[PDB]
Design an enzyme around this catalytic site. Structure first.
Site, PDB file in Angstrom:
ATOM      1  CD  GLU A 102      -4.741  -4.485  -4.475  1.00  0.00           C
ATOM      2  OE1 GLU A 102      -5.026  -4.187  -3.288  1.00  0.00           O
ATOM      3  OE2 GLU A 102      -3.617  -4.922  -4.805  1.00  0.00           O
TER       4      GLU A 102
ATOM      5  CG  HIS B 243      -5.513  -2.705  -0.257  1.00  0.00           C
ATOM      6  ND1 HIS B 243      -4.641  -2.619  -1.325  1.00  0.00           N
ATOM      7  CD2 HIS B 243      -5.198  -1.677   0.574  1.00  0.00           C
ATOM      8  CE1 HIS B 243      -3.845  -1.577  -1.152  1.00  0.00           C
ATOM      9  NE2 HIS B 243      -4.162  -0.988  -0.008  1.00  0.00           N
TER      10      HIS B 243
ATOM     11  CB  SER C 247      -0.931  -0.019   1.239  1.00  0.00           C
ATOM     12  OG  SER C 247      -2.048   0.848   1.068  1.00  0.00           O
TER      13      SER C 247
HETATM   14  C1  HUX Z   1      -5.191   2.236   2.778  1.00  0.00           C
HETATM   15  C2  HUX Z   1      -5.252   1.922   4.291  1.00  0.00           C
HETATM   16  C3  HUX Z   1      -4.584   0.612   4.867  1.00  0.00           C
HETATM   17  C4  HUX Z   1      -3.925  -0.192   4.030  1.00  0.00           C
HETATM   18  C5  HUX Z   1      -3.168  -1.636   4.406  1.00  0.00           C
HETATM   19  C6  HUX Z   1      -4.055  -2.867   4.157  1.00  0.00           C
HETATM   20  C7  HUX Z   1      -5.372  -2.875   5.107  1.00  0.00           C
HETATM   21  N1  HUX Z   1      -6.369  -3.646   4.623  1.00  0.00           N
HETATM   22  C8  HUX Z   1      -7.604  -3.697   5.400  1.00  0.00           C
HETATM   23  C9  HUX Z   1      -8.556  -4.480   4.776  1.00  0.00           C
HETATM   24  C10 HUX Z   1      -9.864  -4.567   5.474  1.00  0.00           C
HETATM   25 CL1  HUX Z   1     -11.170  -5.400   4.865  1.00  0.00          CL
HETATM   26  C11 HUX Z   1     -10.002  -3.826   6.778  1.00  0.00           C
HETATM   27  C12 HUX Z   1      -9.021  -3.085   7.325  1.00  0.00           C
HETATM   28  C13 HUX Z   1      -7.716  -2.991   6.574  1.00  0.00           C
HETATM   29  C14 HUX Z   1      -6.657  -2.192   7.067  1.00  0.00           C
HETATM   30  N2  HUX Z   1      -6.714  -1.441   8.227  1.00  0.00           N
HETATM   31  C15 HUX Z   1      -5.388  -2.116   6.264  1.00  0.00           C
HETATM   32  C16 HUX Z   1      -4.194  -1.240   6.661  1.00  0.00           C
HETATM   33  C17 HUX Z   1      -4.631   0.176   6.314  1.00  0.00           C
HETATM   34  C18 HUX Z   1      -2.842  -1.555   5.883  1.00  0.00           C
END
Ligand code: HUX
Ligand code: HUX
Ligand code: NAG
Ligand code: NAG
Ligand code: NAG
Ligand code: NAG
Lengths: 532, 532
Positions: free
Chosen positions: A324, A437, A197
């Site tokens: 994603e 993602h 990310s």
């Molecule tokens: C773009 C924000 C972000 C990106 C990375 C991947 C990430 N994915 C998440 C997926 C879900 Cl469904 C719920 C919560 C999530 C979360 N706090 C994160 C963290 C926060 C790390």
């Protein structure tokens, strides 16, 4: 003692930790910068003053101040990402996992956490580096950096809050690894930076920025690229948002000096409480404080840098996940819910397109709608839901990454591209979200090898294959073991544009990853928005 | 005598003709207007002055003055469309085929030939009405009308060359059928007009024009619609082209009176020789002299008439062929040839798009290119050739027809839609052209029933099925025989939008004919061109 290491900043004492019925050394919470507190809030980081005595590096450090996800209280799916240590502005530390016995000069991998530049921690269970350090015999480092306003508030022209300081935090940690990793058995000449990310966008930003290039050898980018539409803003937009932030906190807005002074007196939580109020549009996948095209860290626009070959030339390994966009839609688009199949009505589809391309005029919205609508079956709720998932994913992650990979490959020394589409068998999120993602991370860090976590034997095998691809690439610039008998991950070339899928099935090679949609997002739509 | 008929204009004597081992009566070359010659060139037609004695109606009349196709000298594929009688400005006649013994009051079908408003003849072998008259027991009429500058030169405001006179020629013939067809055994209250290409657009124009509506009962449109982009021009563009025509013939351009006088002194061939020089763009599927939105024949814009329901409300039967565009590409786009497979390079594809959408700016051209390009295989010469075929066909025939059918069905009393996709086994044109513009006509006129023409037994069966659908529709407003056991052609409705294929296979019902491409051509592109 294997747990005592003398660095140029002082001595540190680690701790022995068990991992897969064995042990390795961990040096947790080593400081690499002075605490960015008080009058230092918003400023460039300062090198940590050397210390006498022994620094206790047996426990994790604090996490930086950040917005905390409370959308599903008590749900592990979301809480597994929240800070798991106390939050504090005193948060600039790094962690190192070292094979036992201690290596002499082995490959180093430095992890940069993601979180849209507004959140993230180096201490998450899913970022535990012991499995990778132990399994692949690499020295694994995870750094930290300021997020939110603390790391990216930008009032260009001022030296008190210049912008990009979160990126400079990352750079200082990379400088410390370069200067000191030899004492832990790592080779400062074979350091690979990798992140997901915003962490992936960050990796690309260090490839671009002249000031960071010399500090690492190779790079890996997961679901993120420097040119992503959410990864940077102009100095004018950065300024506008800093002023609007002050306005939310009833600050004097007469001068940068007045604004900064006011913002510095506020408690961390006061800034976090109004952080989201400064976005310019009703949108999803947009974050308030992110890197700024300042003319310093980034000499010119990202696109002209990519076009001119103005970047570090080396090998890179990068890729994306199948769905994603699902995460963002669940959290911010009408009609999507955690506990239902979320079939989308045509009305919510239209609302969704609008939130996904906040910067588009009506003609642009119509172009996107037509591109993703099947007019022979326009009221199919599953197609509407999945169409919206692809729109968010293609626009924000996949097509920007494909543009970066095609521009880099022209001047680089080797590119390896992947498409991760395996849905974990123990996933707690609903089926409609697919391959989310952030969910390839657990396979990169080897969590499937831990029996109690409940993955299948095939998932353990997949994790091992991925860990070995990543580590072999860090060590040699090629994920494949040359003389091996296993299926080969081909090089991505300007001409053939090959890539592989990453799942439990037999490797399969494809070409031109989502090319049809990406020509729409990278060439047509931008041209339509500029003409109209 | 069965061959002598007393009409309100005088007596006419027909001739007995053999047809499928039997006989019927034919009254060929009956005059319905004064010859539009001399000072009458470009003027509205005049009713034919009644005559004493017996008019010899045993042979075909002259064909109107027109451009003649010499692109493939001696090739039947193209010569079968050229005038097969002497050309002359004295050409306003009609032909009637009558069952033997003579009917008392039976269904009437009036054919209006196509030819882009620049060519066409009622005497072509493929328009021989004896097979249909004989087989379905209908009185079959084919009229004629002026084409090219002679029928459509338009200097709005002048009464010497007002424009649309070719359409008024058609109307006068329809008036004559209304007034006299009873004497030949036809029912003036059950007249169906049908035509192909410009003939089909003409049928739709008589449905729209207040002055024509009362002259017929029902209508059939083949591969043509009133709203087609090539079927009409504004009065300003019509004027500009009339002046440019005069300029090509070194005429005095001081006044309409001066221009018209000069044009009237020129020999027919002088006008035809420079006819194509007045088009405003380098294009294909565009013709110089066509109907004009004058405020008289057409009270307001075609679109507002369709939107307000300002048109004749009745039943209609209409459709299109699979590869409407191949003909135009062969004749006017680089890279296409009669004797090769015509695989198209990306360079000729791009040249082709430009010729196909002459009115588009660069953003519009890019939108079309993206819509029809498969970016996973962009150098596939067959896909490029076929993509271009669809572009020409969708833009010029199919999508305009689908827009007309959807607008008409809202106020009409019954719609039946078809998609003709059978490639004749004895076709002399290359395989790449597919099912060509104009090649469903031979099946409508029953040529496959003639053994010497070499069609298959299945093709004879198909022709019989089509002739019966057309004739049953003319007679009842429904192509299906109610109590029959055969597969039923469903009604096209606003909601279900059903249609059927017409070929040698078992009937198959589909929905939303080329809906994806037509939303692009009827809603998006027009919106993009207006915004930009
Ligand atoms: C773009 C924000 C972000 C990106 C990375 C991947 C990430 N994915 C998440 C997926 C879900 Cl469904 C719920 C919560 C999530 C979360 N706090 C994160 C963290 C926060 C790390
Ligand atoms: C649009 C012009 C036109 C339309 C109708 C169908 C038609 N189709 C043709 C197809 C080919 Cl390949 C070659 C020649 C053709 C021709 N002169 C015609 C005539 C002319 C009648
Ligand atoms: C810090 O190090 C000491 C050893 O000096 C250890 O006992 C302690 O548990 C470590 N962490 C704590 C308790 O904060
Ligand atoms: C990388 O660089 C080396 C030496 O500069 C060269 O020999 C090799 O071909 C390059 N590899 C690629 C994939 O460009
Ligand atoms: C015209 O009619 C006469 C009969 O009066 C007929 O003999 C002749 O063949 C017809 N056509 C001709 C020869 O022009
Ligand atoms: C046509 O009109 C008749 C009488 O006006 C009506 O009863 C019938 O339903 C109509 N048919 C259609 C298809 O609209």
């Amino acid at each position: 003692s294997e747990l005592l290491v003398n660095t140029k900043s002082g001595k540190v004492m680690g701790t022995r930790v068990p991992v897969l019925s064995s042990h390795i050394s961990a040096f947790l919470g080593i400081p690499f910068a002075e605490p960015p507190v008080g009058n230092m809030r918003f400023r460039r980081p300062e090198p940590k003053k050397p210390w006498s005595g022994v620094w206790n590096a047996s426990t994790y450090p604090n996490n930086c101040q950040q917005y905390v996800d409370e959308q599903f209280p008590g749900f592990s799916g979301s809480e597994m990402w929240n800070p798991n240590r106390e939050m504090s502005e005193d948060c600039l530390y790094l962690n190192i996992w070292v094979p036992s016995p201690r290596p002499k000069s082995t490959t180093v991998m430095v992890w940069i956490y993601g979180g849209g530049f507004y959140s993230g921690s180096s201490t998450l269970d899913v970022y535990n580096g012991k499995y990778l350090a132990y399994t692949e015999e690499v020295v694994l480092v995870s750094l930290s950096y300021r997020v939110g306003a603390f790391g990216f508030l930008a009032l260009h022209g001022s030296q008190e809050a210049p912008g990009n300081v979160g990126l400079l935090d990352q750079r200082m940690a990379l400088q410390w690894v370069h200067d000191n990793i030899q004492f832990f058995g790592g080779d400062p000449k074979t350091v690979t930076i990798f992140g997901e990310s915003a962490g992936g966008a960050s990796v690309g930003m260090h490839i671009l920025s002249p000031g960071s290039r010399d500090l690492f050898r190779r790079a890996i980018l997961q679901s993120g690229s420097p040119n992503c539409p959410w990864a940077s803003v102009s100095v004018a937009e950065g300024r506008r948002r800093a002023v609007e932030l002050g306005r939310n906190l009833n600050c004097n807005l007469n001068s940068d000096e007045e604004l900064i002074h006011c913002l510095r007196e506020k408690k961390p939580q006061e800034l976090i409480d109004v952080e989201w109020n400064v976005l310019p549009f009703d949108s999803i996948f947009r974050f308030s404080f992110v890197p700024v095209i300042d003319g310093e860290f980034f000499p010119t626009s990202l696109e002209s840098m990519l076009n001119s070959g103005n970047f570090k030339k080396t090998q890179i390994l990068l890729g994306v996940n199948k769905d994603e966009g699902s995460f963002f839609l669940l959290y911010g688009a009408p009609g999507f819910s955690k506990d239902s199949e979320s079939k989308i009505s045509r009305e919510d589809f239209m609302s969704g397109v609008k939130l996904s391309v906040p910067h588009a005029n009506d003609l642009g919205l119509d172009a996107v709608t037509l591109q993703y609508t099947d007019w022979m079956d326009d009221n199919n709720g599953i197609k509407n839901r999945d169409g919206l998932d692809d729109i968010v994913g293609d626009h924000n992650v996949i097509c920007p990454l494909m543009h970066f990979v095609n521009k880099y490959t022209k001047f680089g020394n080797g590119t390896y591209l992947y498409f991760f589409n395996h849905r974990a068998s123990n996933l707690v999120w609903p089926e409609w979200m697919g391959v989310i993602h952030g969910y390839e991370i657990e396979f990169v860090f080897g969590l499937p090898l831990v029996k109690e976590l409940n993955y299948t034997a095939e998932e353990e095998a997949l994790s091992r294959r991925i860990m070995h691809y990543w580590a072999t690439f860090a060590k040699t610039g090629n994920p494949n073991e040359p003389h091996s008998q296993e299926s080969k991950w081909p090089l991505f070339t300007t001409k053939e544009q090959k890539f592989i899928d990453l799942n439990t099935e037999p490797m399969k090679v494809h070409q031109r990853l989502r090319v049809q949609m990406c020509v729409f997002w990278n060439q047509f739509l931008p041209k339509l928005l500029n003409a109209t």
